[PDB]
Amino acid sequence: FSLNEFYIDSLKANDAIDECSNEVYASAWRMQKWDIPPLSLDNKTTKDCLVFEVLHAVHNYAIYGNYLHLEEYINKKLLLINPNEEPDSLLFYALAYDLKFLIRCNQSQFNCDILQLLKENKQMSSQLHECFQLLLEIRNVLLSLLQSHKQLDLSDDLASFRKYYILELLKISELIVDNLQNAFSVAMLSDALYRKFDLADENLKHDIDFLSSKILWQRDEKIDAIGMLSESLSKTNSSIFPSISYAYLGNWLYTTKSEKTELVSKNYFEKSLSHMSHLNAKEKAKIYCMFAQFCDNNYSSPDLTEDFKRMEKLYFEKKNDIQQLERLKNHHSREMSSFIIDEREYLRMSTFRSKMLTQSITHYLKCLSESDENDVLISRCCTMWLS
Amino acid sequence: IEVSNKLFERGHKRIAMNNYLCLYFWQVLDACPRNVLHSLSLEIWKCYKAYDITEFPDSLKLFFSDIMGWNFFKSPEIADLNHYIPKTDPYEESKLIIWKLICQKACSLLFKYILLDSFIEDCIRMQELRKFLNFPKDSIIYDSDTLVSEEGSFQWVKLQPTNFDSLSNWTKEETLKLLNMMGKSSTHSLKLLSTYMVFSTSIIQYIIHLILLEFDFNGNNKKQKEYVTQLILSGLLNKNTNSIRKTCMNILLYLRRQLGHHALNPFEANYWVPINYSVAASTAYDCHLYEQSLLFLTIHNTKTDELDITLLSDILSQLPCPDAYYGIKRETSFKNILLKAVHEKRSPLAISYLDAANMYRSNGTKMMFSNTLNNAGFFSLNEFYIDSLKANDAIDECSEVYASAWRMQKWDIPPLSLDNKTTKDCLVFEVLHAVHNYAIYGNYLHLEEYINKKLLLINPNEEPDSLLFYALAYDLKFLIRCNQSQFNILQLLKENKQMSSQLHECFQL
Amino acid sequence: IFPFIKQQFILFNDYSPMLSYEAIDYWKSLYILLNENLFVGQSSFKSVFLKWLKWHLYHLFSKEGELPFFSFTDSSIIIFDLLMMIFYRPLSLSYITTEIRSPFERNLFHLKEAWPVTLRFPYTTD
Amino acid sequence: SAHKVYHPKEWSLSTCRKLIAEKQMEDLETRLKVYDLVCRHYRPVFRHFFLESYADPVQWFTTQTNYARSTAVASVLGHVLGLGDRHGQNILIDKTSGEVIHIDLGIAFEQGKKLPVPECVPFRLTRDVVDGMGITGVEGVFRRCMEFTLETLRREEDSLLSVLEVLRYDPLFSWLISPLRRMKKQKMGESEAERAILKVRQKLSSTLSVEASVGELIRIAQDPSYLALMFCGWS
């Protein structure tokens, strides 16, 4: 959006864009530049010109701290939208109502969290292109306009509401606004606001770090996300019991092999399981079941299981050779030392294989039990069970 | 050809004199035939800046630039050897070696420098033979080394009043206050009475290492040892001049290189003079000798294991080696990702994306963004960004701003001043705007004269990319004055079929 | 600032003959020697301004006294010749030996009083 | 001799190996703790070879960088080709430039894994060799050079794979090395060609990105848990 804004004012310098169009205001309301004059209320407007006019009204009613003239503006806007029967009008209606709740309620100014609207279907719900667009960005700019003037803040708990972009970004990334770069941009904004507003050691910092690491890893710069989540998780944090972040970082570490298998299993998944029983929800099943996925990837590796089979073979043939030689006594002693070392290694690796397979089957069963959303894995569990 | 190749198999570094170079092989070479010039050995132009071009006629400099572009275009000579001669010289024999070095330097000054030369002759005449006269040729020993006690240089009023001292008179004062502990030869007059010639730091810096080596373990005890320690420490940290710090670091390294008598380790020999190497390394980093700064940093970390992590990052940021910036990992935040992606200039994990996010989240950047856009190749995006910055005035610079002035073919941006030394981007823009204007209007002599004027001033800077402009001057001249077949640009690489380890310096724009 | 002045100039109002002589000569020297830009910098913008001066605010000086930017001065002809020869030509200045014959009056008013220079050398000084 | 000169207080190079070799039938944690103790006694002294013993700082940095590049390229090529023994004796650093040349490449193509004590580390990166490129560990020059070597070796997978194939059909190249032979080197019926070439394809397989791949390689080369099991002495 910033490169887009650069392009627009560059075009304005060339006097070519005729800055009363939709794209100029689509840049304006997204870059929070409340200096370009809004389009006339009597004159017909597109979606983005309307959104920018409404947001300029919100800005000038938040600088001077009002909840009533904003109502007049919103209602005068909503009066003159429907008769043309534009398909997007319904969306505008939603916007108006959401705005109404941001300047009425003295606490928890948002309705239904929007992210739950996408979580209830447990997918993107694939309504259609025109049914999923542009709401979350206006919610973001509204929320940041709430505390544009500290005379409109007048409290500290709002500055903790300020920092709940995590819902907005779990919504935009997984995709009402239909993008990913905006998710990273708002995550950067949330990090800046956390380092700007309040104490730099809390749990909100860790949650923001976790969301940013998710946004980065999905962009596939895997090692950078690994580092950013491990800087805040593997740390003497405040009230550090985050199970979801621990499970996600363990899965990522085993994905890119950036950490040892035993170390990641003992430091990033057992920590998550120890801090369980306080998030009994769908995320709980997600944690056991990402754990089962990681343990299955541990078991299902082709190369290491090939060496495992060769190792079972040489263990059995060394047992046979011990039987043959027991029937060169010093040679027998050296051989028995060598293959007792081999045998103890065999027991260690076989016990590890049994433990990982049983644990992954059990956590697959749990991933099914706690949440019915993830179902297909039972077949996978079946393949890992009746084999 | 034989003259050219025999000129270089040995060291014949003696054309350093500026008045003696236009007489030397830079005015005779111009008159030599062009085919012969092409047939000359490559080492003539291998060291394009080692020659002192202080005194040169305009035409000679123009011919130098033309031939230098011609020689760059075929078999580029950017690659150079790294190492020079060492400093370690090899108990009475050690003192003999120090005195031998001092007297060899004195004889060299005598040969090179008439009043001053006569004074050095008298100073060398100042009587006892310590076998050190064998190394100088015996003719000087017989003539000026029974001999007349009366000085043959000055007549009690002819002596110089010891003026015109160097800006590095700091070493002169140090040598004066140092040698006044046990005077072997009143070599004292070489520093206090012969300090006339701006010698005033040449011989002083030449044998200050030697006299400091003499002072160390000169006797069982010596306050002058604490004096050398204090003066080294005082010279390392300094103000208003980097040259004094450079000289002090040179003495530090010279003393560190020497073999320490009855020294258990070369390590502790590097610490014969008690000092903290961390402040020395910080000074070297401020002295812009980054490899020397890293040497001091690693010697300090070998002693104290107390490296300055921020200092190490600052050092590795500017290190010329391409595979730097990754030695020290900075724990990742939304500023480390951006800075790491800027250096690579890569499209995956787009630095354009991170810069775009930070430009609106408000989480140095006014140039990093422009350079990332230019390096990625989105020249129109960088044009838009530069125009937006100019509209906001936030850039307020004539650097970046001119990188996209010629690349985007916008010939309305005024050029930078021709007199001032200017960066390669403004350099290229000046040349290219000139050629565009004289293509529009068609005056060939004007373009030639302008390129000559612009190529005359570039030489003294000792900038790494001066030869790169010599190439551009020769190239556009060839592509301009010809009536047909304007090419002269790819064929070299087609023969190479690869970069041929040319490094970013040789091949760029 | 030069582009802003040029935009203000050639507007028939700011572009006036009231400007002192040789100011345009200095501008041309700056544009063709140091800047050395002729793409709307020399022979295009300077030529346009000179043509506007020769057409607008022509033969009507702001002040009649001292021949300010008047046609009586040969310096105007010298500047015109210099500008004509500076339009992308080798030795673009092409100007030498103006033959002032001491009409320039380099020494200022009270030049006889300036010739204080009689006692230039102080007693036992310098 | 550098460790016997710079730090005479610590244990000699023959003082620690013997006790490292003393534990041969023990668990992994015992080896890890003994290696931690030994590497704490022996500080890395290689970095002094380049410094104040070669030349002025420009040459010192040039030879340190060239040593880093040469050891990175040699290490990547050893991993891709499965190079085996990497003794200190079997690496030669050129006093003129510092680059490392690997002599005695008689054990390669997984043969090193067949030794009585398998070389679990891909390429030797013990504490001294890591110190060699300076105060920095295996980061900067080393990691980037390894990345570039792996990327280029994967770009030319077809031609290099064909070359290794023509070695496979060559009857002289015995992709099989006798176990007794293998034993000797450390002391100082299936066609193995197809399995070895499959391993080489896997080491050049682009399933895992090159950056994280060389990161994992560096991790195994530096993690003391692996290095404590490499071999008795071997350092």
Author numbering:
A (entry chain A): 1876 to 2049, 2052 to 2204, 2218 to 2277
B (entry chain B): 1474 to 1485, 1488 to 1565, 1573 to 1595, 1597 to 1609, 1617 to 1635, 1638 to 1678, 1680 to 1691, 1693 to 1857, ...
C (entry chain B): 537 to 651, 653 to 663
D (entry chain B): 2546 to 2733, 2763 to 2809
Can you provide the manuscript's text about this entry?
However, the activation mechanism of ATM/Tel1 in response to DNA damage remains largely unknown.
We focused on analyzing Structure 2 of the active state that binds to the substrate peptide, with a resolution of 3.6 Å. We designated the substrate-bound monomer as Mono1 and the other as Mono2. The hydroxyl group of the phospho-acceptor threonine (Thr68) in the peptide substrate is oriented towards the γ-phosphate of AMP-PNP, forming a hydrogen bond with His2632 in the catalytic loop. However, the Lys2730 of the kα9b in the PIKK regulatory domain (PRD) of Mono2 occupies the Thr68-binding site, and Gln2731 occupies the Gln69-binding site, thereby competitively preventing substrate binding in the catalytic center. The Mono1 N-lobe packing against HEAT 34 R (residues 1583–1610) clamps the substrate peptide and defines a confined catalytic chamber, whereas the N-lobe docking at HEAT 32 R (residues 1470–1483) in Mono2 stabilizes a widened active center and facilitates substrate entry or product release.
